Amino acid sequence: LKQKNRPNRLIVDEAINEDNSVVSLSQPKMDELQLFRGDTVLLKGKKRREAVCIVLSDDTCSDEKIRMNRVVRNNLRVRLGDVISIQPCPDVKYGKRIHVLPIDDTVEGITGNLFEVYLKPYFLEAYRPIRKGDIFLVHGGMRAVEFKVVETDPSPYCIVAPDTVIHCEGEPIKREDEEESLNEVGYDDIGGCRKQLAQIKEMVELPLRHPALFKAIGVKPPRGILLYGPPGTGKTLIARAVANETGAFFFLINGPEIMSKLAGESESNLRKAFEEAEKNAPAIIFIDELDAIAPKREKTHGEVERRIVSQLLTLMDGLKQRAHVIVMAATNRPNSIDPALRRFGRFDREVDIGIPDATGRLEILQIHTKNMKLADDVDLEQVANETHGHVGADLAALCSEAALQAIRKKMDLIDLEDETIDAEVMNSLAVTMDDFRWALSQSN
Amino acid sequence: TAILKQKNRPNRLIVDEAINEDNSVVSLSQPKMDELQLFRGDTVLLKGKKRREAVCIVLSDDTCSDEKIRMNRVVRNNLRVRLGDVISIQPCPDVKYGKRIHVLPIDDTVEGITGNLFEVYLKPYFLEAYRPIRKGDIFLVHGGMRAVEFKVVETDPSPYCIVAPDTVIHCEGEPIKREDEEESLNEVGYDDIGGCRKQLAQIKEMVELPLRHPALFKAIGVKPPRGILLYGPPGTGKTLIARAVANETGAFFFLINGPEIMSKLAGESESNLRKAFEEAEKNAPAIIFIDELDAIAPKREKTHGEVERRIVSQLLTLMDGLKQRAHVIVMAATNRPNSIDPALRRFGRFDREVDIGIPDATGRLEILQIHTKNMKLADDVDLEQVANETHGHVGADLAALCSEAALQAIRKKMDLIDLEDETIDAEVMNSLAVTMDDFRWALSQSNPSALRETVV
Ligand SMILES: Nc1ncnc2c1ncn2[C@@H]1O[C@H](COP(=O)(O)OP(=O)(O)OP(O)(O)=S)[C@@H](O)[C@H]1O
Ligand SMILES: Nc1ncnc2c1ncn2[C@@H]1O[C@H](COP(=O)(O)OP(=O)(O)OP(O)(O)=S)[C@@H](O)[C@H]1O
Ligand SMILES: [Mg+2]
Ligand SMILES: [Mg+2]
């Protein structure tokens, strides 16, 4: 399952100084996709991100490419070189009302009126298409303020007409809250697991997306997929990626969380989870750390704990064949799970999330340093070759330790008591190959 | 002995085709109608598989053989029978004019523009026709340039009536899901169990026969055993048999799931058990099936909980509480028979056993035919050769093998399928078939290959 060439799949190309509402295509491409000048289009990027734009022709734009500015790439969670999908969006209505909020670090200090100084001049007679979850930057006077679209009516996208009511009242959105959102886990955040991600897409995503395919040939797909492997191999990471990437409804069940609940409450929450997924099908239930709620019925010295395992088995069996629900699970102790849960029609398929090789280790090292300030002498392939037996969690800690050693090297220019860290200390900070070699030497 | 085989009776006929025939009409030969005292236009009751019924009008037919009954696809579909199957026919004189009927469309036949369902479809279909209909009937109607499938949801009188001019036809409500009816159509019957001919006979003689004909046992002066335990290794079709019995039996059927009872609160587990036996008693003749008995009734030694011992005591009291006039038979299943409390296996409790074991080559072929009947097979697929290469496999292993062959066939087309597409390419869909190569691949992928060693 690799990405297929389709006429509406295009490579993200730059458009410096371009308006936030505009994407550019070549004329022959627009002709092919039956797209006309001014048409409203729907763009799809990574981690289920969407953007609504106006399409314009461009003779400097290659057929296979789409030009878009930084703000739009940021909304689609894509980089230059990435592939997006484009489709016509004819059903977009004039907005009745929209609610936007400023990002807190762009509104620090003197303000004036956000609507009058920023939003009114930005939207004025422009008829901008916008989507809930859009981030956009506006210049007003001598200042820049970043806004988030929090709600639209109609939802989740509309055109901001002259009659659209623009709301900007409320407590500003925290930069840190949106940073966590921007850097939510995607499939690109999982390294050294290419074959496993393919197994998961074919056993989980494919039957939920295309149940016609399986009915056609006359096969019922397996409904229980167990990910197994040693600690820190990225089982929970994969759960998070699936959560953020899937077209289906996703309900996470945390083993320890259910087991922390009162007697009766543990079983109740389990029932509530399966009910919610059924109602919202197609759906994925992920039961993380399955061994916590479902150990061998021998290794249980409590009535409630045996009761909980019975509850899960009944819920698995209770998933009638028309429910369009797939249950995923993860464990670092697969031999410790009750054998009854691994029977036909339950968790009958398995995915080994194991120890990565040298190439996989390099993938993980690239992922965890992508937002890290690296010096030019840093050779990550050489780091990859020196970390045999390491899993993804060991490699994350190694990168962290190199970084902390880099900070430790400047504690003779840093005073803890200071209100502010010295600017040159801040701007010069980089992790060296020496910091990595030190981290490699410090060890498990 | 598998001696309970289907007997030749005058009203038992072989299902034969009637292309272009009306949904309300069945055809018999004249001598057959004479024999059964059936006249032209008489209303008849047809009985098929899985307790399915159909009410039709009978007409004579000189092209129809004496031993056969002609019926169209819609009627066969309602009786859950194929060409070649046997059905029973009987006069149905007590059928009254309906006061009201409620029908609902199937959702994939009503996608898009509609008009008026009653006016365009149902009124012209029923108009002056005096059609007999039964609750649970599925029928197709042509109206304008379109076809819409309907389900009879309720009749008054229930469960069948004649749709007269004065019968009120209701078609309001949310359309019935095709998937939901597909689940119903393919509910488990005895034909869905392969490699268990002798065991199905044991079950019919120990369960069905005493519930159906308690006079037979009273006459000879014998009390039939009331506790039947099915045992055998994982995936041999014990739960499958429970489902088949549930759908085939003339008795009331109450399922008790072991794990389900054990998932309940203290006190609630025992309460549900009492409720199950009470419900079956009230609705006798009845079958109680306790699936996975070992879950609720392990050896009173292997219990480190007061409630779990309490639950076993509860079951024993309920078994003993079944007085000899209750006309209730308790079936159970387990893959751990040695792990059940010995007290439950005493006289007058679970004192009879049925070994649901490992099938032989011929049994395996039966299972392979059942699980591929709704599967698109290429012509090179030799299921007998598959049967001969799956020694040590049980029914569950054969189901997984068939699934894996099909999934491999889909996997072979992932270079023509994009995950992100809204629709799968039509020619990819229409050409999809499972090959003998897909099966050979599946046979090589294995706890098949690792399983042929085991049972020699
Ligand atoms: N394949 C991977 N690619 C990139 N980072 C990884 C990978 N595996 C682990 N990591 C990093 O290590 C962290 C911890 O990994 P988790 O996914 O929580 O481990 P896990 O496999 O769920 O371990 P258990 O069994 O819960 S102790 C992740 O948040 C990642 O930052
Ligand atoms: N004798 C059989 N004939 C046809 N299909 C079978 C047979 N046995 C098993 N199967 C298939 O395998 C599936 C699982 O069988 P079950 O009846 O659930 O197994 P079981 O004997 O109840 O296993 P345990 O003991 O609960 S683990 C069924 O739904 C069928 O699809
Ligand atoms: Mg984890
Ligand atoms: Mg079973």
PDB file of N, CA, C and O and ligand atoms in Angstrom, chain A residues 343-344, chain B residues 192-194 196 233-240 292 335 367 370-371 395-396 399, ligand 2:
ATOM      1  N   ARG A 343      -8.742 -16.157  20.561  1.00  0.00           N
ATOM      2  CA  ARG A 343      -9.493 -17.103  19.732  1.00  0.00           C
ATOM      3  C   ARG A 343     -10.020 -16.465  18.445  1.00  0.00           C
ATOM      4  O   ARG A 343     -10.012 -15.240  18.291  1.00  0.00           O
ATOM      5  N   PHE A 344     -10.484 -17.318  17.533  1.00  0.00           N
ATOM      6  CA  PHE A 344     -11.136 -16.913  16.284  1.00  0.00           C
ATOM      7  C   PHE A 344     -12.230 -15.874  16.519  1.00  0.00           C
ATOM      8  O   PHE A 344     -13.079 -16.048  17.394  1.00  0.00           O
TER       9      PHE A 344
ATOM     10  N   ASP B 192     -25.246 -24.969   7.725  1.00  0.00           N
ATOM     11  CA  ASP B 192     -24.013 -24.226   7.958  1.00  0.00           C
ATOM     12  C   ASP B 192     -23.045 -24.987   8.861  1.00  0.00           C
ATOM     13  O   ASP B 192     -21.960 -24.504   9.151  1.00  0.00           O
ATOM     14  N   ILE B 193     -23.435 -26.177   9.302  1.00  0.00           N
ATOM     15  CA  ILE B 193     -22.531 -27.023  10.075  1.00  0.00           C
ATOM     16  C   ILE B 193     -22.076 -28.216   9.248  1.00  0.00           C
ATOM     17  O   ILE B 193     -22.893 -29.043   8.833  1.00  0.00           O
ATOM     18  N   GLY B 194     -20.770 -28.296   9.016  1.00  0.00           N
ATOM     19  CA  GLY B 194     -20.178 -29.415   8.284  1.00  0.00           C
ATOM     20  C   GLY B 194     -19.351 -30.320   9.173  1.00  0.00           C
ATOM     21  O   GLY B 194     -18.868 -29.896  10.227  1.00  0.00           O
ATOM     22  N   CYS B 196     -20.220 -32.804  11.007  1.00  0.00           N
ATOM     23  CA  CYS B 196     -20.865 -33.116  12.282  1.00  0.00           C
ATOM     24  C   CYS B 196     -22.202 -33.847  12.112  1.00  0.00           C
ATOM     25  O   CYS B 196     -23.097 -33.706  12.948  1.00  0.00           O
ATOM     26  N   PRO B 233     -12.294 -29.511  21.317  1.00  0.00           N
ATOM     27  CA  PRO B 233     -11.282 -28.448  21.301  1.00  0.00           C
ATOM     28  C   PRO B 233     -11.782 -27.143  20.660  1.00  0.00           C
ATOM     29  O   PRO B 233     -12.847 -27.138  20.041  1.00  0.00           O
ATOM     30  N   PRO B 234     -11.019 -26.039  20.812  1.00  0.00           N
ATOM     31  CA  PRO B 234     -11.415 -24.743  20.249  1.00  0.00           C
ATOM     32  C   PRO B 234     -11.766 -24.784  18.762  1.00  0.00           C
ATOM     33  O   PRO B 234     -11.107 -25.481  17.983  1.00  0.00           O
ATOM     34  N   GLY B 235     -12.819 -24.056  18.393  1.00  0.00           N
ATOM     35  CA  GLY B 235     -13.191 -23.847  16.994  1.00  0.00           C
ATOM     36  C   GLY B 235     -13.766 -25.027  16.232  1.00  0.00           C
ATOM     37  O   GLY B 235     -13.722 -25.047  15.001  1.00  0.00           O
ATOM     38  N   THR B 236     -14.324 -25.997  16.951  1.00  0.00           N
ATOM     39  CA  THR B 236     -14.935 -27.167  16.318  1.00  0.00           C
ATOM     40  C   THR B 236     -16.413 -26.965  15.979  1.00  0.00           C
ATOM     41  O   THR B 236     -17.033 -27.831  15.361  1.00  0.00           O
ATOM     42  N   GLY B 237     -16.962 -25.820  16.377  1.00  0.00           N
ATOM     43  CA  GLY B 237     -18.303 -25.414  15.963  1.00  0.00           C
ATOM     44  C   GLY B 237     -19.368 -25.628  17.014  1.00  0.00           C
ATOM     45  O   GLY B 237     -20.536 -25.852  16.687  1.00  0.00           O
ATOM     46  N   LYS B 238     -18.964 -25.553  18.278  1.00  0.00           N
ATOM     47  CA  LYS B 238     -19.891 -25.733  19.392  1.00  0.00           C
ATOM     48  C   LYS B 238     -20.865 -24.561  19.487  1.00  0.00           C
ATOM     49  O   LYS B 238     -22.079 -24.765  19.583  1.00  0.00           O
ATOM     50  N   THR B 239     -20.335 -23.338  19.438  1.00  0.00           N
ATOM     51  CA  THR B 239     -21.180 -22.145  19.417  1.00  0.00           C
ATOM     52  C   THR B 239     -22.007 -22.073  18.130  1.00  0.00           C
ATOM     53  O   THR B 239     -23.174 -21.693  18.166  1.00  0.00           O
ATOM     54  N   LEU B 240     -21.397 -22.443  17.003  1.00  0.00           N
ATOM     55  CA  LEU B 240     -22.112 -22.540  15.727  1.00  0.00           C
ATOM     56  C   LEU B 240     -23.362 -23.432  15.817  1.00  0.00           C
ATOM     57  O   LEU B 240     -24.438 -23.059  15.341  1.00  0.00           O
ATOM     58  N   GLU B 292     -20.036 -22.068  26.930  1.00  0.00           N
ATOM     59  CA  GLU B 292     -18.846 -21.955  27.782  1.00  0.00           C
ATOM     60  C   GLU B 292     -19.158 -22.172  29.267  1.00  0.00           C
ATOM     61  O   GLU B 292     -18.968 -21.278  30.104  1.00  0.00           O
ATOM     62  N   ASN B 335     -14.835 -26.179  25.968  1.00  0.00           N
ATOM     63  CA  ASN B 335     -13.596 -26.727  25.418  1.00  0.00           C
ATOM     64  C   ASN B 335     -12.654 -27.239  26.515  1.00  0.00           C
ATOM     65  O   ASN B 335     -11.537 -27.678  26.236  1.00  0.00           O
ATOM     66  N   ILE B 367     -17.053 -28.342   5.293  1.00  0.00           N
ATOM     67  CA  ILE B 367     -16.812 -27.045   5.925  1.00  0.00           C
ATOM     68  C   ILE B 367     -16.316 -26.030   4.895  1.00  0.00           C
ATOM     69  O   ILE B 367     -16.730 -24.870   4.921  1.00  0.00           O
ATOM     70  N   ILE B 370     -19.254 -24.829   2.690  1.00  0.00           N
ATOM     71  CA  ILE B 370     -20.079 -23.895   3.460  1.00  0.00           C
ATOM     72  C   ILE B 370     -19.478 -22.492   3.482  1.00  0.00           C
ATOM     73  O   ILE B 370     -20.180 -21.507   3.263  1.00  0.00           O
ATOM     74  N   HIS B 371     -18.177 -22.405   3.730  1.00  0.00           N
ATOM     75  CA  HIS B 371     -17.535 -21.106   3.904  1.00  0.00           C
ATOM     76  C   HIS B 371     -17.107 -20.418   2.609  1.00  0.00           C
ATOM     77  O   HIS B 371     -16.680 -19.271   2.638  1.00  0.00           O
ATOM     78  N   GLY B 395     -12.939 -26.592  12.018  1.00  0.00           N
ATOM     79  CA  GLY B 395     -13.783 -25.616  11.309  1.00  0.00           C
ATOM     80  C   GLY B 395     -13.312 -24.174  11.359  1.00  0.00           C
ATOM     81  O   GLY B 395     -13.386 -23.464  10.358  1.00  0.00           O
ATOM     82  N   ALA B 396     -12.830 -23.739  12.526  1.00  0.00           N
ATOM     83  CA  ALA B 396     -12.333 -22.379  12.692  1.00  0.00           C
ATOM     84  C   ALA B 396     -11.059 -22.122  11.889  1.00  0.00           C
ATOM     85  O   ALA B 396     -10.881 -21.021  11.367  1.00  0.00           O
ATOM     86  N   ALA B 399     -12.149 -21.755   8.231  1.00  0.00           N
ATOM     87  CA  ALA B 399     -12.747 -20.437   7.999  1.00  0.00           C
ATOM     88  C   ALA B 399     -11.676 -19.368   7.805  1.00  0.00           C
ATOM     89  O   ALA B 399     -11.785 -18.531   6.904  1.00  0.00           O
TER      90      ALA B 399
HETATM   91  N1  LIG C   2     -18.314 -27.843  12.026  1.00  0.00           N
HETATM   92  C1  LIG C   2     -18.238 -26.636  11.419  1.00  0.00           C
HETATM   93  N2  LIG C   2     -18.855 -26.405  10.237  1.00  0.00           N
HETATM   94  C2  LIG C   2     -18.780 -25.201   9.626  1.00  0.00           C
HETATM   95  N3  LIG C   2     -18.100 -24.149  10.128  1.00  0.00           N
HETATM   96  C3  LIG C   2     -17.429 -24.237  11.308  1.00  0.00           C
HETATM   97  C4  LIG C   2     -17.470 -25.520  12.031  1.00  0.00           C
HETATM   98  N4  LIG C   2     -16.743 -25.348  13.146  1.00  0.00           N
HETATM   99  C5  LIG C   2     -16.284 -24.075  13.152  1.00  0.00           C
HETATM  100  N5  LIG C   2     -16.683 -23.404  12.056  1.00  0.00           N
HETATM  101  C6  LIG C   2     -16.359 -21.983  11.751  1.00  0.00           C
HETATM  102  O1  LIG C   2     -15.511 -21.408  12.755  1.00  0.00           O
HETATM  103  C7  LIG C   2     -16.203 -20.375  13.477  1.00  0.00           C
HETATM  104  C8  LIG C   2     -15.937 -20.506  14.967  1.00  0.00           C
HETATM  105  O2  LIG C   2     -16.591 -21.677  15.450  1.00  0.00           O
HETATM  106  P1  LIG C   2     -17.285 -21.719  16.898  1.00  0.00           P
HETATM  107  O3  LIG C   2     -18.527 -22.567  16.862  1.00  0.00           O
HETATM  108  O4  LIG C   2     -17.316 -20.347  17.514  1.00  0.00           O
HETATM  109  O5  LIG C   2     -16.177 -22.589  17.666  1.00  0.00           O
HETATM  110  P2  LIG C   2     -16.396 -23.251  19.113  1.00  0.00           P
HETATM  111  O6  LIG C   2     -16.331 -24.749  18.950  1.00  0.00           O
HETATM  112  O7  LIG C   2     -17.557 -22.589  19.812  1.00  0.00           O
HETATM  113  O8  LIG C   2     -14.998 -22.749  19.753  1.00  0.00           O
HETATM  114  P3  LIG C   2     -14.703 -22.411  21.303  1.00  0.00           P
HETATM  115  O9  LIG C   2     -14.588 -23.747  21.989  1.00  0.00           O
HETATM  116  O10 LIG C   2     -15.720 -21.422  21.813  1.00  0.00           O
HETATM  117  S1  LIG C   2     -12.876 -21.429  21.387  1.00  0.00           S
HETATM  118  C9  LIG C   2     -17.677 -20.544  13.141  1.00  0.00           C
HETATM  119  O11 LIG C   2     -18.403 -19.310  13.152  1.00  0.00           O
HETATM  120  C10 LIG C   2     -17.634 -21.149  11.761  1.00  0.00           C
HETATM  121  O12 LIG C   2     -17.507 -20.098  10.799  1.00  0.00           O
END
